C-alpha cells in the first residue's frame, strides 16, 4: 500500500472530485427554477440529511478497510460484491460524456487564441442564419426564430449538430474534437501514470487555478452594469413554490451528484490514508468547500446573466432557458465577447472548465483503477500502466460515439440517464449493507478505534433512518417520472426513454446477477447460503 504523503494531497484530491463541472451551470439554473433565495434552506437540509453522512461513511469505509470498491464487500458483505462492477460501468458511462465535454471546452479554448473571438460577429462560415440578436444596439429587432452568433458557433462549428437529424441519424466524426479528446486522454494517462503521488501532484495545481479564476470572474462581474438584478433574482426568496416536492427532489439530486457519494471515488481516495487520520474533519471541510464553490459559481453566473439582461433590456429567466453544457458556451461566451478583455477572460474561463473537468476525471479513473487492482493483487506488479492505458483506450472508444456531429444528443442522454437511479440504488445498497448487514454498532466501533471517538447519535440514527430513506425517496421519485429531454429544436423520441432505461439498468443489473451467482456457487440449504453470504470471510 502507498501513502498519500502530505495532508494537502488527499484534501485537494477530494476537493477536486467534489467540485466538478456540474455545479457551475446546473446548480444556479435549478436554484432559479426552484424558488431562488428560498432554495438554500432545502439545499442545506438535504445536504445535512443525505450527503454529509454518506460522505463521512464512505470516507470511513475507505480509510478503515484500506481497500477499493470490490474488496471492501469481501470484508463487510460478500453478497454485495457486484457493486464494484456496477461502479466501473457507471464511471465509464459518466467518463464518456465528461471527456467529450472536456474536449468541447478544449476546442473552445483553442479557438479562443486569437485577438477577435470567433463567436462575436455573424461574418463567419458557421454564423449563417438568424443573427438579429446582438448586443449594444438601440434598435429592438425581435424575432421568434432568431438566435445569437455564439449558439451558431457552438452548434454548427464546434458540435456541427446541423449535420444530423437526431439520435436516429448519427453520421460522421469531427476530427478536431477527436484530436482534442486524444490530447486530453494523453494528459489524463500522464496524470495517473505511476500512481496516486503523481495524481496528487497534478491536482495540487489543477484544483487551485479554478478558485483564483472564480475570484477574478467575481471581481469582474460585480463591476458590471446590471449584475445587481441577477443577484437579487438569484437570492429572491420564493416560498410559494417550496410547497411542492419538485424543489426538494432537485435539491437532493443536486447535492448528491455534487458531493458524489457511492461513486467509488472516496473509497479509493481514503484507501491510501493513514489509520490515524481524521476523516470527519476532511469530509466536513470538503463538503463546505464544495457548497461555497457552488455558491460562488452561481453568483458569477447570475451576475453575468444580469449584466447581459441589462445590456439587452430583457427580463431575466429568458436569456438562459436552455440548460446543459450549452448554457456556459452560449451565455458566458456572449458575455466574454461583450467584455473589453475578451481573449484573456475567455482563455481563463476555458482553462477553469478544463481543470474542473480534469480533476473529476482523474478522481474517477484513479478510483476505478484502485478498485480493480485491489480485487486482483496479481496484476499489480507489472500491469499498472498497462491497465491505465487500457482504461483510457476503453474510455476513448466509449466517447467516440459522442464525438460525432450529432453527438450532443447522446451526451445529453448519458448526462440525464447515467446520472439517474443507478448511482442512487448503489449508494442505497451500500448504506443498508453497512447499517444492517455489517451492523451500525460494529461500524461505530471501527470509527472509534480508527479516529479515537465514536460519532455522535446524529450520524448513528441518520445512517439507519434518513440516508437510506432519502435515497429511496429519490429513487421512487426518479422512477415514476420519465425525463422529457429536448436539445436545440429537437424533441427526444419515445425509444430514447427505453434506451436510457436500458443503459441505466445494465449498470445496476450486475448486483442481482452476482447475488444469484454467489447463492448458487455455495453449497448448503437456503438459509445456510444466506448466512454465508453476509458474514465476512476470514483474513
Amino acid at each position, epitope marked *: 500500500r502507498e501513502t498519500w504523503g502530505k495532508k494537502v494531497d488527499f484534501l485537494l484530491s477530494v476537493i477536486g472530485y467534489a467540485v466538478d463541472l456540474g455545479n457551475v451551470w446546473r446548480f444556479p439554473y435549478i436554484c432559479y427554477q426552484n424558488g431562488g433565495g428560498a432554495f438554500l434552506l432545502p439545499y442545506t437540509i438535504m445536504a445535512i440529511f443525505g450527503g454529509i453522512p454518506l460522505f463521512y461513511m464512505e470516507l470511513a469505509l475507505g480509510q478503515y478497510h484500506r481497500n477499493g470498491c470490490i474488496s471492501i464487500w469481501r470484508k463487510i458483505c460478500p453478497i454485495f460484491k457486484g457493486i464494484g462492477y456496477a461502479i466501473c460501468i457507471i464511471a465509464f458511462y459518466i467518463a464518456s460524456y465528461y471527456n467529450t465535454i472536456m474536449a468541447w471546452a478544449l476546442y473552445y479554448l483553442i479557438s479562443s487564441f486569437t485577438d477577435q473571438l470567433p463567436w462575436t460577429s455573424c461574418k463567419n462560415s458557421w*454564423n449563417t*442564419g438568424n443573427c438579429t440578436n446582438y448586443f449594444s444596439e438601440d434598435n429592438i429587432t425581435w424575432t421568434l426564430h432568431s438566435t445569437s452568433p455564439a449558439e451558431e458557433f457552438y452548434t454548427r462549428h464546434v458540435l456541427q449538430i*446541423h449535420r444530423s437529424k437526431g439520435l436516429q441519424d448519427l453520421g460522421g466524426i469531427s476530427w478536431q474534437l477527436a484530436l482534442c479528446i486524444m490530447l486530453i486522454f494523453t494528459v489524463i494517462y500522464f496524470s495517473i501514470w505511476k500512481g496516486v503521488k503523481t495524481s496528487g501532484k497534478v491536482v495540487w495545481v489543477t484544483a487551485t487555478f479554478p478558485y483564483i479564476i472564480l475570484s477574478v470572474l467575481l471581481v469582474r462581474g460585480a463591476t458590471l452594469p446590471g449584475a445587481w438584478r441577477g443577484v437579487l433574482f438569484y437570492l429572491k426568496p420564493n416560498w410559494q413554490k417550496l410547497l411542492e416536492t419538485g424543489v426538494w427532489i432537485d435539491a437532493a439530486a443536486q447535492i448528491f451528484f455534487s458531493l458524489g457519494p457511492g461513486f467509488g471515488v472516496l473509497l479509493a481516495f481514503a484507501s491510501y490514508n493513514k489509520f490515524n487520520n481524521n476523516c470527519y474533519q476532511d469530509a466536513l471541510v470538503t463538503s463546505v468547500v464544495n457548497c461555497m464553490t457552488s455558491f460562488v459559481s452561481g453568483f458569477v453566473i447570475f451576475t453575468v446573466l444580469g449584466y447581459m439582461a441589462e445590456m439587452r433590456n430583457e427580463d431575466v429567466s429568458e436569456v438562459a432557458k436552455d440548460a446543459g453544457p450549452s448554457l456556459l458556451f452560449i451565455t458566458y461566451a456572449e458575455a466574454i465577447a461583450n467584455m473589453p478583455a475578451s481573449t484573456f477572460f475567455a482563455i481563463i474561463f476555458f482553462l477553469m472548465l478544463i481543470t474542473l473537468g480534469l480533476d473529476s476525471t482523474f478522481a474517477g479513473l484513479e478510483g476505478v483503477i484502485t478498485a480493480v487492482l485491489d480485487e486482483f493483487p496479481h496484476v499489480w506488479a507489472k500491469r499498472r500502466e498497462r491497465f491505465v492505458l487500457a482504461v483510457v483506450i476503453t474510455c476513448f472508444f466509449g466517447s467516440l460515439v459522442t464525438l460525432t456531429f450529432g453527438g450532443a444528443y447522446v451526451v445529453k442522454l448519458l448526462e440525464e440517464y447515467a446520472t439517474g437511479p443507478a448511482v442512487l440504488t448503489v449508494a442505497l445498497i451500500e448504506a443498508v449493507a453497512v447499517s444492517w448487514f455489517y451492523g451500525i454498532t460494529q461500524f461505530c466501533r471501527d470509527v472509534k478505534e480508527m479516529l479515537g471517538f465514536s460519532p455522535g447519535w446524529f450520524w448513528r440514527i441518520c445512517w439507519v433512518a434518513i440516508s437510506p430513506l432519502f435515497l429511496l425517496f429519490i429513487i421512487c421519485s426518479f422512477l415514476m417520472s420519465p425525463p422529457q429531454l429536448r436539445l436545440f429544436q429537437y424533441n427526444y423520441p419515445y425509444w430514447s426513454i427505453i434506451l436510457g432505461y436500458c443503459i441505466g439498468t445494465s449498470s445496476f443489473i450486475c448486483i442481482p446477477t452476482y447475488i444469484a451467482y454467489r447463492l448458487i456457487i455455495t453449497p448448503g440449504t437456503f438459509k445456510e447460503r444466506i448466512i454465508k453470504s453476509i458474514t465476512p470471510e476470514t483474513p
Partner: antibody
Framework: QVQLQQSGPELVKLGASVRISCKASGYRFSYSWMNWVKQRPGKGLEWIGRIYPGDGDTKYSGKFKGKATLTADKSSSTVYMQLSSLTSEDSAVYFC??????????????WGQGTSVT | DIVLTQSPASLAVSLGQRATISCRASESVDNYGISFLNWFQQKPGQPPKLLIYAASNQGSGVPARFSGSGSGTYFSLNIHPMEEDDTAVYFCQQTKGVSWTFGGGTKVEI
C-alpha cells in the same frame, strides 16, 4: 426584395484615383458581405475583395491587396472602393455583388449594373 | 488560394441535349456539411446572375433545367434540356474561408 444601386461610369487617368460606390438597399446592410468583381473586356471575372459592414473587416485575394480600399457606411448603406495607381490594366467593369449567408455558401446572388471604367 | 480549372474551355452542343460543365477545385471546399462552391452565368451586356448555390440547391428565379451536383473537389453543371436562351458564360466560384476566386468560364454556344 433586394436591389443594389451602383454609381455611374468614370474616366480612368494615369496615376489618379477613383471611388466607386454601391448603394445597397432592401436587406440587412450590416449582416451581409459586399464583394466586388472585375470583368476585363473580352476576359473573365476577377475577384477584388469583400467587406463586412457589421464590423468593417476587409479581405483581399491578390494584387488588389494594396491598391483597393473597401470602406463601409452604415448610415447611408453604401460601400465604396478606393482604387489607387490607375493604369491601363484597371480599365474594366467593376460590379457590386452581395454575398448570401453561410448556408447558401456565400452566394453572390444580387449584383449591380456595373460601372464601366473606360 | 484555391484555384479552379473548368473543363472544357468551350462547349458547343445542339438544342435539347445535355450540357456538362466540370469544375475541379484544388482543395476541399466542404467543412460544415455544405459545399462552398457556386455557379454563375453572365451574358454580353448583362451582369452575372447566380444559378445554383452550394452546388446542390437552385436559385430563386432559376429554372429546374440547371441541375447541379458533385461534392469534394469535383463538381458538375447539368443543363438539360437547353434552348437558345442558355448560350452564355458559366463561371465556377468557390467561397472557402481562405479566398474567393472565380473559375475559367465556359462559353456555351448553339
Amino acid at each position: 426584395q433586394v436591389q443594389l444601386q451602383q454609381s455611374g461610369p468614370e474616366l480612368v487617368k494615369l496615376g489618379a484615383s477613383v471611388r466607386i460606390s454601391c448603394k445597397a438597399s432592401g436587406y440587412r446592410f450590416s449582416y451581409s458581405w459586399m464583394n466586388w468583381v472585375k470583368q476585363r473586356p473580352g476576359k473573365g471575372l476577377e475577384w477584388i475583395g469583400r467587406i463586412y459592414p457589421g464590423d468593417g473587416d476587409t479581405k483581399y485575394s491578390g494584387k488588389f491587396k494594396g491598391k483597393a480600399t473597401l470602406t463601409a457606411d452604415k448610415s447611408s448603406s453604401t460601400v465604396y472602393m478606393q482604387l489607387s495607381s490607375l493604369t491601363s490594366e484597371d480599365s474594366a467593369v467593376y460590379f457590386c455583388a452581395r454575398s448570401a449567408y453561410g448556408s447558401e455558401g456565400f452566394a453572390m446572388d444580387y449584383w449591380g449594373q456595373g460601372t464601366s471604367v473606360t | 488560394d484555391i484555384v479552379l480549372t473548368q473543363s472544357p474551355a468551350s462547349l458547343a452542343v445542339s438544342l435539347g441535349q445535355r450540357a456538362t460543365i466540370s469544375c475541379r477545385a484544388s482543395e476541399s471546399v466542404d467543412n460544415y456539411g455544405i459545399s462552398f462552391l457556386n455557379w454563375f452565368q453572365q451574358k454580353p451586356g448583362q451582369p452575372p446572375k447566380l444559378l445554383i448555390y452550394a452546388a446542390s440547391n437552385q436559385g430563386s428565379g432559376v429554372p429546374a433545367r440547371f441541375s447541379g451536383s458533385g461534392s469534394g473537389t469535383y463538381f458538375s453543371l447539368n443543363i438539360h434540356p437547353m434552348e437558345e436562351d442558355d448560350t452564355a458564360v458559366y463561371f465556377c466560384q468557390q467561397t472557402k474561408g481562405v479566398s474567393w476566386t472565380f473559375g475559367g468560364g465556359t462559353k456555351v454556344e448553339i
